[PDB]
Every structure is written in structure tokens, then in C-alpha cells.
Design a protein around this ligand. Structure first.
Ligand SMILES: CCn1c2c(c(=O)[nH]c1=O)[C@H](c1ccc(C)cc1)C1=C(COC1=O)N2
Length: 127
């Protein structure tokens, strides 16, 4: 099978705005996770073709990744912070569903998610 098209990262028909919370998600939350030693499997859409995982997109129908999130934030694609938080959660959940508990990639995701949840407790109040 071919890869699917990646998630959209811009849409002229989708209203957009900047908020202090979305700015924080880009400058602090994404920045922190993106540069983490365990980030690399999550920095781009899953390339099931190159990686040889012919069942990935038969199993995962809600793909999401930090490369997509990074572009959505940079492009001001989101209207609210919850949209972005949901994308991170979807990314982690996909990993936990596709892979076996105890697999190294699951441990990587869990470490990233722990950090993620800490940082979103620090979300600033909306101005
Ligand atoms: C996020 C998508 N994904 C990936 C892999 C996987 O086993 N399961 C999976 O859900 C695979 C891999 C294998 C072992 C480790 C320690 C990390 C990553 C892999 C990537 C990218 O490069 C790769 O070697 N992604």
C-alpha cells in the first residue's frame, strides 16, 4: 500500500487566530518535546512504506505527528489550544494502539507524554 496523504496543516476555509496559549504550545511545549532525545519517531507522519509496516494505516485511521502539529502551530491553523492538545493526545494514543505494551517506542511515547502533561499544566491564562 501507498501512504495516505498527510493531515492538513493549512486550510483557507478554517478560521485561524493567535492566542497566548497557542503561542505557549509552540514556544514551550512543542519546542521541549521536539528537541527531546525520543522525539524523532514522532517528528513526521508515519511513513509506513519506507518503514515496512503494511498494516499501519489499516489499524490507525487517525494519524497525527509533531511535524504536523509544528506546521499547524506555525501556520496559525488552530483556533484554540484544545485542538492542539487533542492532536498530541491522538499521536500518543496511536502509538499505544499500534505497538505492544513494553515496546521501546511505547516507553519513548510514555516519556514524551509525561513531559507533555507537565507542560500543559503550566498553560498560561488566556489574555
Ligand atoms: C511512530 C511510528 N512508529 C515507528 C516505529 C514503530 O515501531 N512503531 C511506530 O508506531 C519505528 C521504531 C522502531 C523502534 C523504535 C525504538 C522507535 C521507532 C520507527 C519509526 C520511524 O523510524 C523507525 O524506525 N516509527
Amino acid at each position: 500500500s501507498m501512504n495516505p496523504p498527510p493531515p492538513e496543516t493549512s486550510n483557507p476555509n478554517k478560521p485561524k487566530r493567535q492566542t497566548n496559549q497557542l503561542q505557549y504550545l509552540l514556544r514551550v511545549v512543542l519546542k521541549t518535546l521536539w528537541k527531546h532525545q525520543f522525539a524523532w519517531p514522532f517528528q513526521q507522519p508515519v511513513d509506513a512504506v519506507k518503514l515496512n509496516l503494511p498494516d499501519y494505516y489499516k489499524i490507525i485511521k487517525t494519524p497525527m505527528d509533531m511535524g504536523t502539529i509544528k506546521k499547524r502551530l506555525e501556520n496559525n491553523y488552530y483556533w484554540n489550544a484544545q485542538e492542539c492538545i487533542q492532536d498530541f493526545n491522538t499521536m500518543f494514543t496511536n502509538c499505544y494502539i499500534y505497538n505492544k505494551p513494553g515496546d521501546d517506542i511505547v516507553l519513548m511515547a510514555e516519556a514524551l507524554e509525561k513531559l507533555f502533561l507537565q507542560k500543559i499544566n503550566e498553560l498560561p491564562t488566556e489574555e
